[PDB]
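Researcher: Going back to the complex we discussed earlier. I've cleaned up the inputs and rechecked each line, so this should be the final set. Can you rerun the prediction on the complete assembly and write out the structure?
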Amino acid sequence: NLIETRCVLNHHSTQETAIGNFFSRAGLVSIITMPTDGYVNWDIDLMGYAQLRRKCELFTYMRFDAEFTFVVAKPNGVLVPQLLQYMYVPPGAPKPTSRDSFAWQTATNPSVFVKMTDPPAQVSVPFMSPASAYQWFYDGYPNMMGTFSIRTVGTEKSPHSITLRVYMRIKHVRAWIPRPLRNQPYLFKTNPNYKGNDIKCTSTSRDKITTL
Amino acid sequence: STILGQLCRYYTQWSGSLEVTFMFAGSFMATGKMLIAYTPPGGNVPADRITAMLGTHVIWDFGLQSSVTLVVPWISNTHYYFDYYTTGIITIWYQTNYVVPIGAPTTAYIVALAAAQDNFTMKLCKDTE
Amino acid sequence: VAQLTIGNSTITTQEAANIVIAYGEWPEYCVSVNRFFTLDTKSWAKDSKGWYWKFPDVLTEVGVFGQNAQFHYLYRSGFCVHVQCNASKFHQGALLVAVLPEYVLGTPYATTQPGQVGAVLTHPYVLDAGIPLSQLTVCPHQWINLRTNNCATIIVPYMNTVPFDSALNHCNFGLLVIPVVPLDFNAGATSEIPITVTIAPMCAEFAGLR
Amino acid sequence: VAQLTIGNSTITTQEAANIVIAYGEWPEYCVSVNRFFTLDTKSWAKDSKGWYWKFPDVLTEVGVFGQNAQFHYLYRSGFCVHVQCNASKFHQGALLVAVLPEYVLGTPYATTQPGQVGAVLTHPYVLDAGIPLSQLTVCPHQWINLRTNNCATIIVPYMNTVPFDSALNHCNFGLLVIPVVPLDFNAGATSEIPITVTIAPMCAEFAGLR
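Model: Rerun complete. Updated structure for the full complex:
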């Protein structure tokens, strides 16, 4: 319901629509459970959610950094003094295949060791592509950034269920070549396919052209 | 049927360049496009539009210009009944179809004019047949 | 009415000083390759939907540009596209001519890269990619309106993340021609209107070492 | 659009600077004789073949030029001929307007020198003289093409082997108008297109002592 009064006359500053301010906020990108294997693998994926896929696909070539933060607790709030290990596998190194494989002790996969009772750990990741910028649209026939691996430290099964959440901020953003915004529902995470049996119009509908 | 083809019956050898001028004689309201392709001597006739485009060609739209010229670079002849003759082939290709509004006629006509250039010479006068 | 002359190929067009430059940049560096290639003519009918050509897939089987791309590995060039239409003053309609970098289609090799003939869109409201037609004018575009003008020229520079790339796998941009306002006429006129595309490469380099 | 004014006769024509001068020479020397005489109009039909007028036989029964030639013995003048056509933008055709000095016909006095009306060719492919039509453009000629232009003017000087000659026996040149490309139209338009000839003598002298 629209109403009449309270009009504004003073113009606003143009810093509110800078390209850095459009992606400045940090949001949840994944949720990783681990019930009572013992290891998980979550590769870095931006288009895991329908939100922020529609916002990055406004442009074509983007170049940025990242900043991750791992909030970790039990399935219901509480904390216990448990030691953890977050291993970051760069693009081009083999992933751990077991709870006690050789890749957990490789000297070139950097890790962090935190307890559950600490403030959450914060890691920054630089621009990793061999090209000059990422691209969400590749026309030819054949954007990986890495893979996080998380396990509980020990040679013995821990009697605790762990659920952690991953947050991600984006810094020093540059963009190129804008593009129309997608107005159709998604099907997969790789290709821009739509459902051809029905096409949802962009606008809503009204009865006649004269009834405003 | 030209005047150049009748004066070259009085001689034996000639060489030089020519030029061919076309002229559209249709209604004012119609338009279209033609492709004037010229094959160099010793080559083959083009089989379709796409191979003729790669050679030497002009693009003639008779909606703007009603006439166009094409220059043959070099011809030669040494007569002996057989003659040593090095010339090409000129072909006309429908680029687009003929588009015409309501009331104008459907068919048109092209007239082809021909003349020699500055550097056209001949020698060895010979009485004709 | 002027008459251009590049190489051994001459066209006759109006010297029209209303060209568009894609993003304000001229094609710059990092014998018979600079001429005027002319594709086939597509016939605009009353129920046509649209056409597209992928670059530089359209020029891989044509001329010396077709054989240079099939031998050298690396490749880099700009372009200059010229689209014109030929209709009398009794027809009506409008076309939208816009380029689109990294055009990815949506549901074979005979459809994504059709070659020199081009292909036909099936759902032109969503461009066969899920993005709506009504916001296409954020790209470099030009309006062809049969009431006034019959010409459209775009200058497209090289847009890629690497300074050199292959010419048989990647396709940089696809050019789109969509009839927004349909063609209409009375009976007794020409039912099919031709559309003619003309390409000319600018600042082409090959360093593939063949 | 200008309006000429010579004597007591004014015509309205376009000031067209594409005249032809026969052999590059202006009429020079060795009251009411310099004006604009306008002959009758010939109707171009779908099956017409051609027309011709012999000079100066056409102006021996018209005006003060007609009575001056019938009294004086000697005679010498140049000419200036203006041929124009009036058709709309839905007709098509082409005319060839060329002069021909010492035009001798081939098989009576009512055909070789017809007078002011003119005559009609019977075999226009051979000009009724055995010479082919296709080489007529070696003479001073001008193309009338109904697509573009509707005017043709030739300046003809005096061409004879003697400096003065009679005006009732000799005829210097005959002007020819031949429809190379025939007239075509759809039904419901004007079936007959008019052709109008206009003569104006330049540098006329009479020394016949009457």
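Model: Worth noting: Chain A is about 0% helix and 30% strand.
Researcher: Good, that matches what I expected from the previous run.
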